[PDB]
């Protein structure tokens, strides 16, 4: 229709994109998780045993997460 | 064997759950303004007189008692419906200092899912066929099925929700 048609090409080309960046975000946020809870675990029984500093280096780290997904959202 | 793939709607650990379904809930919005923009015209006011899925299903729209539109125009007024909760920050708060409200699922995320899926079911009921004649029923599938999977994973549809498309949505799960 050479007007359907070119915003077919374009809808076809988003879901590529999107759904690509979509999985790029759910295993890289699965992998950064995973080196913290390795890195809370091989500090959790050395010296100092500090089960808050520990405990809130988790939630630094979850609301330092929490505010990357919020901004997927609120494009400008 | 083991299960899916786009169980990318699982949350992910040790993070609010208001967040996971309000980034979803805009993502969703998102996919479905893409796949109705592009059979913006062969869904007209002559060819859909009346927001329809199969001819026991229609959805009205008020503006105060529901009345009956075309398609085209109900889709116009639910994405400019959408926008006004997405702008009202005491509901989706784009600043990060901000809070979502009491019961942000059950008032926010459901009403808006529930809307949503209509237009899943205008088109598969009103224009496979046309999908069918542009590789889209590929890009449908995959963003009808992920909206069951989000959809499933969090119990935010009943059954009575997926009206018409009830029967097919049972192949899944
Ligand atoms: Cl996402
Ligand atoms: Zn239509």
Redesign the interface.
Known sequence: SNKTQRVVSVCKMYFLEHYCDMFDYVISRRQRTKQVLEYLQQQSQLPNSDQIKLNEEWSSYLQREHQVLRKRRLKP | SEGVLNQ?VKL?????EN??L??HC??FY??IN??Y??????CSPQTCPRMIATNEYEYLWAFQPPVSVSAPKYVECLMRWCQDQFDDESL?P?K?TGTFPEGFIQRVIQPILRRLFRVYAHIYCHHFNEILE???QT?LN??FRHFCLFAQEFELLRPADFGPLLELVMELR
């Open positions: 990318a992910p650990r040790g993070e609010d967040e996971w309000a980034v805009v993502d998102n996919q893409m796949l923009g592009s059979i913006t015209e062969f989706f784009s990060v542009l590789n889209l890009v995959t963003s």
